[PDB]
Amino acid sequence: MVPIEKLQVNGITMADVKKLRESGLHTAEAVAYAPRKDLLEIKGISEAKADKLLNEAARLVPMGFVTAADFHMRRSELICLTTGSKNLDTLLGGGVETGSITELFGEFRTGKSQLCHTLAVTCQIPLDIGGGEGKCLYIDTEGTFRPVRLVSIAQRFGLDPDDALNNVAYARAYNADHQLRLLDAAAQMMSESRFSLIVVDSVMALYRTDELSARQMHLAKFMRALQRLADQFGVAVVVTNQVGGNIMAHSSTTRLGFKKGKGCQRLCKVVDSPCLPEAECVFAIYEDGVGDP
Amino acid sequence: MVPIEKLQVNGITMADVKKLRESGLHTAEAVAYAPRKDLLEIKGISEAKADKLLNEAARLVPMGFVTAADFHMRRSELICLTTGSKNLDTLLGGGVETGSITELFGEFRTGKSQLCHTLAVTCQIPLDIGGGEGKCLYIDTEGTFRPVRLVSIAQRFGLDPDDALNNVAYARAYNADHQLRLLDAAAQMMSESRFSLIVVDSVMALYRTDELSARQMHLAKFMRALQRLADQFGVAVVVTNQVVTGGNIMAHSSTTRLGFKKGKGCQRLCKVVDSPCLPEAECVFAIYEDGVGDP
Amino acid sequence: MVPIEKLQVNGITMADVKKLRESGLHTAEAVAYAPRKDLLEIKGISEAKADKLLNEAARLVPMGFVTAADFHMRRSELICLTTGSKNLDTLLGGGVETGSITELFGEFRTGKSQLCHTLAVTCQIPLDIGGGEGKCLYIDTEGTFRPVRLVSIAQRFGLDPDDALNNVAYARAYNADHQLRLLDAAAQMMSESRFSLIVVDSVMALYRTDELSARQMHLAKFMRALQRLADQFGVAVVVTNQVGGNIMAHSSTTRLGFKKGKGCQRLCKVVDSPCLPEAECVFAIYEDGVGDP
Amino acid sequence: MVPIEKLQVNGITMADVKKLRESGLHTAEAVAYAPRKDLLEIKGISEAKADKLLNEAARLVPMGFVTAADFHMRRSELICLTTGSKNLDTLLGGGVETGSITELFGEFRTGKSQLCHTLAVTCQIPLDIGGGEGKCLYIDTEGTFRPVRLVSIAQRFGLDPDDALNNVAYARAYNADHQLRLLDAAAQMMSESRFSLIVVDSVMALYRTDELSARQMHLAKFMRALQRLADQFGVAVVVTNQVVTGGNIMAHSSTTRLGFKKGKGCQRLCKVVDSPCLPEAECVFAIYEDGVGDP
Amino acid sequence: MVPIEKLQVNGITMADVKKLRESGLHTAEAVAYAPRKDLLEIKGISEAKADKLLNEAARLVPMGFVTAADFHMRRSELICLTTGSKNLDTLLGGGVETGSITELFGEFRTGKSQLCHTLAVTCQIPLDIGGGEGKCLYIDTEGTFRPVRLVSIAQRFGLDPDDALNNVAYARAYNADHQLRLLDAAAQMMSESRFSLIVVDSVMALYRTDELSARQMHLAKFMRALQRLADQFGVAVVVTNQVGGNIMAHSSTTRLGFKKGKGCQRLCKVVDSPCLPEAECVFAIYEDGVGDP
Amino acid sequence: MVPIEKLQVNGITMADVKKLRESGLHTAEAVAYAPRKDLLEIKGISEAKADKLLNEAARLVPMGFVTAADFHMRRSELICLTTGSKNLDTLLGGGVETGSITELFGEFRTGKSQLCHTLAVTCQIPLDIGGGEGKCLYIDTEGTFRPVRLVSIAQRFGLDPDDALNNVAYARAYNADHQLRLLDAAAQMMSESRFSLIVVDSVMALYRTDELSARQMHLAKFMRALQRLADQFGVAVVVTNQVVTGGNIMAHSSTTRLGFKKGKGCQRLCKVVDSPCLPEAECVFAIYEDGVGDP
Questions:
Q1: Sign of CA dihedral E18, E21, E27, E31
Q2: Residues in chain B closer than 8 A to C147 (CB atoms)
Q3: How far is D77 from chain C (nearest CA, A)?
Q4: Which long-range contacts (CB under 8 A, 24 or more apart) does C186-189 make?
Q5: Nearest CB to B174: which of A33, A67, A221?
Q6: Which of A271, C44, C47, E130 is most buried, judged by most C-beta within 10 A?
Q7: Which CATH entry fits the domain spanning D1-72: 1.10.3720.10, 1.10.260.40, 1.10.150.20, 3.40.50.261?
Q8: Burial class of D26 by CB neighbour count within 10 A (0 to 12, 13 to 18, 19+)
């Protein structure tokens, strides 16, 4: 993530830039990726001044071709947050991949919710054990997010609880629009400090409740922005979807199918996933987060 | 194709010419095809000097008549990368035709994505089997491009994978504009080495809010450039359009349109809706881990 | 069409004339119609030698008054290529008139393209059935011309296909200028052998893509040259225009409005046309060319 | 008008005179009006012999003063072919005035063409209704002259059509020059029989590349000849100019200018922009299958 | 103006004189000014008889020296026709001066034509209001003279229109020669009745159309004759020249430059003019002739 | 100068003499210079009586030799009215020389007219500043003489205007002949009072048709008379010739020729083309409301 401050060169003022922040951009990436028009329309950005930026950011953020093999290197040298279950990680190839969206879907109470939570912490863990050493943005749509249940997990991984929670940004989205108003405001934040993973749970449900078509745009438009944020900040996005489901599949590179196992075990497939192989395997749920049987 | 470097003659300097590269042109063809105006506008190009070029390129690239039959031959001798499915090829009259744009459209996950990959490889395949022996330019707008899934395909057709991949230019476009800034940088490439197919997936990002009228208009300016490059380089351009002026700007500018619908399981239907020569007719194909294929 | 060779008399040498060919002229008509200046500027044509030509051609090509009624005779004794649809011909008064431009316009895929093709063949047909026994110059701007689809049509009319195609001059125009560079080079040809009809499709579209004013001159200038060629060689020019549109109307004597009928039928008007009466009527499209329902 | 044949007197031979025809002149008027020089230049015309002519024609055609009022009478007694539309005539103060050139200009398809046709016939109409009882000279530069469309008009005014048509000299000019070579041949005609109006449509072909300065200059040399013939023969000259020095060479040399704009449907507006006598004022007219008319 | 009849004395017969009229002369002035030779060549005028005339007229028409100051008196006691615009007259020192040529020049349609017309009437007006109580000779070269537009002006000044027009001699000059054949015939007339002003409009234009040198003589020769006529009859000559231009300046004592103002106003300078001061000022044009804004 | 009245002695009567005035002579000089014949022809002049005159005038006006140097002095002591422009005077070696004719020629409006005016006044100016203290004879052929424009000049040099003007004899000549009839009447004047310069503008009216040979010849007979008067009276003769034998009759008979060309704005070039003493050399001057001057 290249802060915008690095674009203050060869004629760009922290004041021009400032006009970008309040405009929406929050990283070279932003600029770089931002459409030309979208800079022209910022009051005060000169059609010439705009070209000076795009040109600059483009020097700090790769906007170029690369052999396809060459691509594949830069991709795999990516950090992998951990589930908490050997059997599960082993199936994910180490764990939830960052830079990309990863969709968790299944029937109610099949052990999705439960995993985000865990993940919501193992993303604070030291790279060597599994984590990502970054904070966490947790977007909760339903209303089921209770912090209380995280201590028990943090503990398992050793982390001053009341401190580990101060390490988690919580948002309750009340309407599908809102759910995007936030994404912006969460960049302003992934800008200031360093996060390791975002979790929207559940991307959908707010979209049913509160035509289709229209809906089906709003949604996409979201899955995109999320995607972006992953490119923009290197985080790991995890989205749950409880049984439109394409619009996600599309923009989600890892899909993970959960089924209700026996008692408190839970089966779970890797259904369609670029590199990985279609293999199910069992995991389970305790009082301290996901884990092995 | 004829590199611009060949126009450096009888007065034309590599410095004149460079003024043409940064202008847009990247092949004799380009110059040739280029309207007159379009050269005079170039800062530095003398109304006389321009005449000197248009006249030179025209000597290196035809643009004259030919009998119709004479024409129809040339058209058959022309390459056609292959889908991977007899039933499908058989429908396309052998495969995706080069020199023209070919549009693959349908609802999400109906088999388009899958195809481009395959096609992404079959373009490196020897003419006799089905390929084009050329590299491949792939412009990815969504972000769902993962190379890993090409080995399995390459293997299917026998090719040192970590070698085939080094045989594929990948670009992820982040903004409607950029999607265009690339095309140009991609000519500078198809100039240096020889490519067989271009794939933009999906062009219809041009419609995202990153008015209508305007957007409808960019999507043309693009589709045209694309088409151009197909003229310029002989390649084969394949564009997906995902349903989820609009579908028209397409319709007009594309030469072959192919609609995809979700079959039962991993089978997938697919019509040849609208296409000059070809007859309207659907058929089924299917999807596996090493790429498209028959059922 | 009086070949230029007939001007080799009373002091004109095949060598003077030759200096005309490479200059542009390709028929007495050419000369006759050619401006005085335009001969003077040919290097080697003597202001006296020039007058000797103009004077001569003028003896072979009528450049004179005629009662207006008298005109009307020489006009109607003109050959008429056929559409392939009784209902359609019947509306055109027999079919597309030669010597004049005839504009086919309508919305995309309303059965224009389809007709040129047909026409592109019925112009090889024997006068008694409908045709013009001449070849065909087909200028295609778009890129949609596929010969393959002509056999099926030729067949319908009986014509050694691979032979009927050898009977069609194909040009792909890449830039509006080019589109005129050709017209010249197509005279050199309508000079050598005998053609029955020209088809530029679509005169416009290359003019939008690749100010107005300037454009609006270039265009006219074209519609003119076409017109000329019709006077010069007696052919039939057919131009499609897909929905500046005046510049054509003006220089086009027959205008024919196509609308999309039901299924594969296609309605079509005779909108403004000298002699004929404003009457619509339906036709249709098959695999072997235009035809009746 | 006074045919040259009348100058064959007191020495002047039909052979002297013929030397004047092939020179340009075709009427006493011509000779009369002709500058002196312009006769001396004629190979064969003796500085003395010329004096003998200028002196003779001047006896057959006045060119002297007259009171102004005396003048203004003559001007009213003068014919005025009619448009076909009360509203329009009423605007032109009765119709197109003879003896002068009258310019009809406007964008393509704004009703000019249409008018000339009508006018092309109303000039054969009996003075009492509106006509001029004369034939018509029509010089067509474009190629859009189709007689067929005159019957319908002739009929409207009652005239054996295949008879009215034989009452119209048609010329298609193919080159700027030729347009002039004709005017002369057209005098030889207006000499033999009696014509009522000339129509060149459109004079402004004189501007096509079949420099400017030069072209601007020819368009005058022409407009003047035209004007001349109006003097020479009493006719009425009507020129269209299609928009699509230039519009000035016009402006100066034309006596009545009329601008046409496209009304709603088949109605058509039309101003009297600039004209000695007449007042600036627009009005609407309209177009049908048998020619101009009111709405 | 001394009529020739006054030379019938001490041996001159109305018959000798008659031989002068048909010869060209039309006033003592004529004779007086006429070259000796030009009387000798009149068939019947005796080299002695000729001297008897020259000698006589010279007694009726001043042909002598005068102090220069003395001149200046006889000049200013001259009548001044009026423009119709206070601002304009005020700039002309009362209006167009008589006895002398006054050139009106400017670009097409800059309000020249329009003024002659007016002037063409205010020269019938009673000396006390502005006019000259004389008739008007109007030589029109172009063809733009329509009497109709004069009533409206005459009216403004009160004058039986159909009567005021009977008070104007109109000539249409078709060739530069002609334009002088007239001048003579207009003397025969300014001889019979009394005129107040001549207007040739435009002295030039007929001279371009229908070498230079030759031209440039013919012209001068004219501007002279006009001048003369002004001496000969006391009239006011007004000539328009629309933008050789020296040949006029020279023989024109008042030059007046017109420029196109805004709407229907018209600016106008007094560019070089003996007595007067170089001062521009605005006037305007209506339906009843020149006038003030 | 010596008035003829002085010859009334030893027999010569004012009546003899009058017979000489009406004959042409108006000064001893005249008589003196007069060829013998030219007196014998005078009706009344006895071959003996004439001898008595020629002998008397010769006593009052020299006509004998003098050394050359002796001559060249006299020539410097001689007056020179002034142009009004240092640069110009400096070119004429002080100004327009008296005793000789000085020709000012050039295209219309090139500054000649302007000059004569000025000169028309500077001739009334005190010797010490530049003038000649004499009146001025101005013969105007064109008709463009307006006094009004002399005040402004007179003022420039300080002179009660309505007084300076009464110090200028104006003649408008209407016919080639008359132009001559005047010269004579103008001697009767330069006899009575003392004048400093004569100005005929423009002599070359002598060429208007109010043959050639003849006209060429009159223009001399004139130029000579002029020259004469310069002998006779000491004045300074200035003639303009406007371009618009001919230019030769001039050339031969004029002593100083000055060519004028139109400078930029109101500046004006002017060469000393051909003149005995003076060197060929141009220079610039300029024109204002109070007469000639420097730039």
A1: negative
A2: 68-69, 71-72, 75
A3: 30
A4: C186/B65, C186/C137, C186/C139, C186/C229, C187/C26, C187/C27, C187/C30, C187/C229, C187/C232, C187/C233, C188/C21, C188/C26, C189/B65, C189/C137
A5: A33
A6: E130
A7: 1.10.150.20
A8: buried
